[PDB]
């Protein structure tokens, strides 16, 4: 087999109402030795909370077996280490993989909305841009709204490392030019550990 | 045994006839016991004989790394020819074949828009000049900034991102001193992509 260990989604660790989890994915499980055991540890202290998902027979005739561990928001954000220890009869010895939050001082994102270029105003749809810079760690979530309703026609770049060791990204919301021209107000919502209440919003309208 | 990585040309290299685009087939984890490596190269399945293969080089981990480089014609790559590298070695149960080409699809022309700093950014020492490039296909592209003929050092560009209509977009962010912006220096975002006339377009930005 092989073992991959995955962090929680950024949004999930920032809101207590959400449920962040670490996920341990075991691939290339054969039919001849299908028995997978998981042990989990949080800073070396064994914990007992994880659930194994119903496996998927993969299209290469191997099993994908997945364990999910719920994490405390504040444990993840304070940098605790999550160790998944995997065993299987085709493995020489148990594989461990460990994960934790990027290390270092969190830095507050600066959020800037930018209207469409004049040149773009010739098209049927236009691009509303939210630049989010100066943040650390790169874990962040960005969404758009209007009139408190999610606007879902948007795409956000991955975080990119900037020259000062912080990250930036851009999010692009596309809207019908007629919605823009009629003065509708659009909001770029940013969630990040270094924002007050883990959230901020910036408006954009004509 | 050995593992093979096959690398495409850089996007600028296939777009400018002055440049030399190359496909590079790298074999690592070649052992001492079976160190001979043989490459065979194909273009659309037809064998070609003009690659340049370098002697094996031992790595610090006591395996060999062996590289073969095939020059490609600009128009072959841009017409979607498939380049196959086949690597034979006596430790393998069968030769390893790897293939690379430009992503399949009709090319699409990048639309290039420049956007000035947000009003709110103007209380900072440095401001952000943004170039939005969208609607392009395939995703191979190059973006640069300059002012007064000279390249601007401090910019970063996002990877291409797949858009909801199947084309790509990206943004590139040039950081300048607020004073330079304020004095009306003209900056220009230049873009190179196969679906642009002369594989180039440029858009300017100033206050
Ligand atoms: C023994 O040593 C050798 C040599 O290492 C050297 O010496 C040792 C002792 C140490 O000192 C090392 O620090 C030192 O470097 C080891 O050889 C390495 O082997 C690994 C695999 O085990 C290779 O990993 C691959 O790397 C490529 C990227 O490689 C480029 O970038 C590297 C730096 O980032 C650079 O080091 C490489 O030279 C190479 O650089 C490029 O070179 C090309 C050609 O010259 C040039 O044109 C470019 O300009 C230049 N670029 C840069 C940035 O410099 C990476 O792409 C591979 O990942 C793919 O495959 C993975 C599976 O193996 C997979 O998980 C990844 O997702 C990815 O998969 C690809 O995904 C995309 C979709 O996005 C898809 O399109 C692809 O199809 C898919 N590919 C596949 C195959 O599925 C991968 O990580 C190292 O390159 C190689 N090092 C060298 C120098 O050749 C060896 O491991 C050691 N052995 C042991 C037993 O220890
Ligand atoms: C049989 O069929 C199977 C399915 O097709 C196939 O299983 C596949 O196996 C490969 C390994 O062989 C495995 O590859 C890893 O993928 C990691 C990313 O996985 C993400 O994203 C992919 C899509 O990109 C999804 O398919 C995955 O499901 C997974 O999704 C994430 O999962 C959880 C859901 O629980 C979510 O929370 C996430 O939201 C979700 N993300 C996304 C985007 O969807 C990738 O990290 C791995 O890369 C690392 O390891 C490689 C070595 O194997 C390195 O080459 C690579 O460089 C990465 O290295 C790490 O990088 C760090 C620095 O960047 C280093 O510090 C680390 O040390 C370094 N690790 C190293 C060197 O070991 C890796 O590619 C696929 O995930 C898996 N597919 C599925 C569906 O599970 C089988 O192989 C098939 N078998 C055979 C024999 O043919």
Author numbering:
A (entry chain A): 238 to 443
B (entry chain B): 237 to 443
Extract from the study:
Fcγ receptors are cell-surface receptors for immunoglobulin G (IgG) that play pivotal roles in humoral and cellular protection against infection. The hFcγRI is a major immune receptor expressed on the surface of macrophages, monocytes, neutrophils, eosinophils and dendritic cells. Human FcγRI is a 72-kDa transmembrane glycoprotein that recruits monomeric IgG1, IgG3 and IgG4—but not IgG2—with high affinity (KD ∼10−9−10−10 M). Intriguingly, hFcγRI is the only receptor displaying a third immunoglobulin-like domain (D3) of unknown function.
To evaluate the conformational changes of Fc, we determined the crystal structure of the unbound protein at a resolution of 1.80 Å. The most noticeable change consists in the rotation of domain CH2 of chain B of Fc with respect to the CH3 domain (10.7°), resulting in the opening of the apex of Fc near the hinge region by 9 Å (evaluated from the distance between the Cα of Pro329). When additional crystal structures of unbound Fc are compared with our structure, it is clear that the CH3 domains remain relatively rigid (RMSD=0.2±0.1 Å), whereas the CH2 domains are much more flexible (RMSD=2.5±1.5 Å). In the case of Fc, the comparison is straightforward, as the resolution of the crystal structures in the bound and unbound form is identical (1.80 Å), and the values of the overall Wilson B-factor are very similar to each other (27.3 and 25.6 Å2 for unbound and bound state, respectively). B-factor and tubular (sausage) representations identify the apical region of chain A of Fc (residues 265−273, 291−299 and 323−329) being the most disordered in the unbound form (B-factors>100 Å2). Moreover, the electron density of the lower hinge (residues before Pro238) cannot be modelled, indicating it is disordered in the crystal structure and probably in solution. In addition, several residues of the lower hinge of Fc (Pro232 to Pro238) become ordered upon binding to the receptor, suggesting this region greatly influences the recognition of the receptor by Fc (see below). Although crystal-packing forces are likely to play a role in the conformation adopted by the Fc chains, these observations suggest that the Fc portion of IgG may exist as a dynamic (flexible) and asymmetric ensemble in solution, as recently reported by other groups.
